[PDB]
Design an enzyme around this catalytic site. Structure first.
Site, short mmCIF file in Angstrom:
data_model
loop_
_atom_site.label_atom_id
_atom_site.label_comp_id
_atom_site.label_asym_id
_atom_site.label_seq_id
_atom_site.Cartn_x
_atom_site.Cartn_y
_atom_site.Cartn_z
N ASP A 105 20.45 16.63 23.24
CA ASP A 105 20.43 18.09 23.41
C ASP A 105 20.77 18.53 24.84
O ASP A 105 20.02 19.28 25.46
CB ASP A 105 19.04 18.63 23.06
CG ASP A 105 18.61 18.27 21.65
OD1 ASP A 105 19.44 18.25 20.72
OD2 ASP A 105 17.39 18.02 21.50
N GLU A 140 21.64 26.01 14.30
CA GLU A 140 20.84 25.76 15.51
C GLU A 140 21.77 25.72 16.71
O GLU A 140 22.91 26.14 16.60
CB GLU A 140 20.06 24.43 15.36
CG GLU A 140 20.95 23.21 15.08
CD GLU A 140 20.15 21.92 14.83
OE1 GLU A 140 18.93 21.96 15.05
OE2 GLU A 140 20.73 20.91 14.40
O1 LIG Z 1 9.72 20.29 11.97
C1 LIG Z 1 11.01 20.87 12.04
C2 LIG Z 1 12.06 19.77 12.09
O2 LIG Z 1 12.03 19.06 10.87
C3 LIG Z 1 13.42 20.37 12.34
O3 LIG Z 1 14.33 19.27 12.43
C4 LIG Z 1 15.64 19.63 12.03
C5 LIG Z 1 16.04 18.78 10.84
O4 LIG Z 1 17.42 18.93 10.55
C6 LIG Z 1 18.25 18.56 11.57
O5 LIG Z 1 19.62 18.70 11.17
C7 LIG Z 1 20.05 17.64 10.35
C8 LIG Z 1 21.22 16.93 11.04
O6 LIG Z 1 21.84 16.02 10.15
C9 LIG Z 1 22.37 16.61 9.04
O7 LIG Z 1 23.03 15.59 8.32
C10 LIG Z 1 21.28 17.22 8.20
O8 LIG Z 1 21.83 17.87 7.07
C11 LIG Z 1 20.51 18.23 9.02
O9 LIG Z 1 19.40 18.72 8.29
C12 LIG Z 1 18.03 19.44 12.77
O10 LIG Z 1 18.87 19.06 13.86
C13 LIG Z 1 16.57 19.36 13.20
O11 LIG Z 1 16.29 20.30 14.22
O12 LIG Z 1 13.42 21.12 13.47
C14 LIG Z 1 12.56 22.25 13.46
C15 LIG Z 1 11.12 21.77 13.27
O13 LIG Z 1 10.28 22.90 13.15
NA NA Z 2 20.81 23.53 24.05
#
Ligand SMILES: O[C@@H]1[C@@H](O)[C@H](O[C@@H]2CO[C@@H](O[C@@H]3CO[C@@H](O)[C@H](O)[C@H]3O)[C@H](O)[C@H]2O)OC[C@H]1O
Ligand code: NA
Ligand SMILES: [Ca+2]
Ligand code: NA
EC number: 3.2.1.55
Length: 487
Positions: free
Chosen positions: A24, A225
């Site tokens: 990040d 995000e």
């Molecule tokens: O508790 C929460 C976390 O679980 C949350 O994590 C996010 C989970 O998804 C992530 O993105 C993945 C990246 O890979 C792809 O293949 C998937 O489809 C996606 O879901 C994301 O980066 C994480 O932030 O974060 C927030 C917390 O509250």
């Molecule tokens: Na950032």
């Protein structure tokens, strides 16, 4: 020299570092250096000592590195941001926060003095801020609570209240971008994937540790995000990671970095396109995509992450991420070209002067050592040293300029129980030997001596390798800083 590079090979600029991880990333450009701040990716283990997938358990610090030249990175260690629960052995700064994800960094001159602000997410639940008088601390938590919560006006409706991006405009006004997630929990509708409406921007007060008014929604198509903001030729560019679910149109590819433009920092924003494929497209596999666009020494760049170090160690990335930088190109019409993410990265911008004090933890390539906070007297804020040095290990800097007259001697600040040697070589790990520093027993790993030895044949611009030798095990010595003298 016997040890090999993990992922950042000699002559390549990506990943920026490979002696530890860093996810990040975000950039601060300040007084001739670029500082990269990162989530503290750090391996999680099963009870039998095997690696398990990243669950973000260790994201309670912020790692910081910096460079003047895009190739040699000074490791400034870790900021112990999170202070709640088990975090940071009681040394955590934000006592209310169990986590410190996805930092953002800003500088603002207030009452004639540059002030620094580090923003982070306490997981998906809020955004905090720390303050300092230098880009590397020490840091203070002036509020004692999150800066932004779901109760902050305009923040209701945000699914994941995280991934902050703070931007200080040319007029000195700061803005905080945050949010993400997709509404609909386990099964969003197509429309919920297409318009999550979870991105936000809120104006900051002059002091950068408060907000003013309410947050506005940025309707980023297929928001997920990774908010980002840069300003190019008077236009504000809000960028973000496009989500992975639902059907997507060709112009909003899943898991890639999208961007929108506006004539004002708070909108209205209009979607323009996308400029960074998922790291998996370049490096294999897939995962989350996180980035920040910045201009350093008059060039535009993007810093992003990829699973390039963990993959090299384990044969699978397992969600553990490392920083990369590549050039970013704006077209005449204001659109942005696809970033050509790769391992070669950015060619060194400027030579390194080997006649100043150079931290040992300032290096371009290594095989294979660690850095950690040092006991050495003096030194810079959060001074580190190179450690886990065994026979045949080495570090190297890019393009040290010894000048026409060249070097007379080499000094190293070292601590050692049993002693060893530092070979100083040009160009390659087996290259021209210009000096050999004998590291004596100093009385122990926390007892420091600056040692001087002769150098000859060191003129002009060269990569410089410091090759470590000795007969003992384990740790031969710790290595804090070095400095050449001019002939
Ligand atoms: O508790 C929460 C976390 O679980 C949350 O994590 C996010 C989970 O998804 C992530 O993105 C993945 C990246 O890979 C792809 O293949 C998937 O489809 C996606 O879901 C994301 O980066 C994480 O932030 O974060 C927030 C917390 O509250
Ligand atoms: Na950032
Ligand atoms: Ca040092
Ligand atoms: Na080692």
């Amino acid at each position: 020299a016997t040890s090999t590079t993990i992922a950042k090979h000699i002559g390549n600029s990506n990943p920026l570092i490979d002696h530890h991880l860093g996810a990040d990333p975000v950039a601060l450009t300040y007084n001739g250096r670029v500082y990269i701040y990162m989530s503290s990716d750090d391996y999680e283990y099963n009870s039998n000592g095997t690696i398990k997938d990243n669950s973000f358990a260790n994201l309670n610090r912020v790692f910081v590195i910096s460079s003047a030249d895009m190739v040699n990175w000074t490791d400034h260690g870790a900021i112990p941001v999170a202070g709640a629960n088990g975090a940071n052995g009681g040394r955590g700064i934000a006592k209310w926060a169990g986590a410190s994800w996805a930092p953002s960094i800003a500088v603002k001159k207030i009452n004639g003095k540059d002030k620094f602000f580090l923003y982070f997410a306490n997981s998906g639940g809020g955004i905090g801020v720390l303050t300092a008088d230098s880009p590397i601390g020490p840091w203070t938590d002036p509020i004692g609570k999150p800066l932004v919560t779901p109760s902050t006006p305009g923040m209701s409706g945000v699914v994941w209240l995280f991934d902050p991006a703070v931007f200080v405009d040319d007029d000195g006004t700061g803005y905080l971008y945050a949010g993400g997630g997709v509404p609909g929990v386990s099964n969003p509708t197509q429309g919920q994937w297409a318009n999550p409406k979870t991105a936000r921007v809120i104006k900051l007060g002059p002091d950068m540790t408060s907000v003013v008014g309410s947050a506005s929604t940025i309707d980023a198509p297929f928001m997920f995000e990774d908010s980002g903001l840069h300003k190019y030729n008077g236009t504000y560019y809000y960028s973000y990671c496009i989500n992975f679910g639902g059907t997507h149109p060709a112009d909003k590819p899943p898991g890639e970095i999208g961007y929108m433009t506006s004539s004002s920092p708070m909108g209205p924003f209009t979607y323009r396109g996308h400029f960074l494929k998922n790291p998996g497209a370049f490096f294999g596999g897939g995962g989350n995509n996180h980035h920040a666009v910045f201009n350093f020494k008059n060039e535009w760049y993007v810093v992003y992450h990829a699973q390039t170090v963990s993959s090299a160690l384990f044969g699978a990335g397992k969600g553990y991420r490392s920083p990369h930088i590549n050039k970013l190109v704006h077209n005449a019409d204001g659109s942005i070209q696809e970033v050509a993410a790769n391992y070669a990265g950015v060619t060194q911008i400027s030579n390194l002067n080997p006649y100043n004090r150079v931290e040992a933890e300032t290096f371009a390539w290594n095989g294979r050592i660690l850095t950690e906070k040092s006991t050495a007297p003096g030194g810079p804020v959060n001074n580190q040293h190179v450690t886990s040095i065994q026979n045949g290990d080495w570090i190297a800097v890019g393009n040290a300029d010894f000048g026409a007259g060249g070097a007379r001697s080499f000094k190293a600040n070292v601590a050692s129980t049993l002693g060893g040697k530092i070979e100083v070589r040009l160009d390659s790990a087996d290259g021209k030997l210009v000096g050999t520093l004998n590291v004596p027993s100093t009385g122990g790993a926390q007892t420091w001596r600056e040692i001087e030895t002769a150098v000859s044949g060191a003129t002009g611009v060269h990569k410089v390798f410091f090759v470590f030798t000795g007969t003992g095990t384990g740790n031969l010595f710790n290595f804090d800083y070095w400095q050449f003298t001019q002939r």
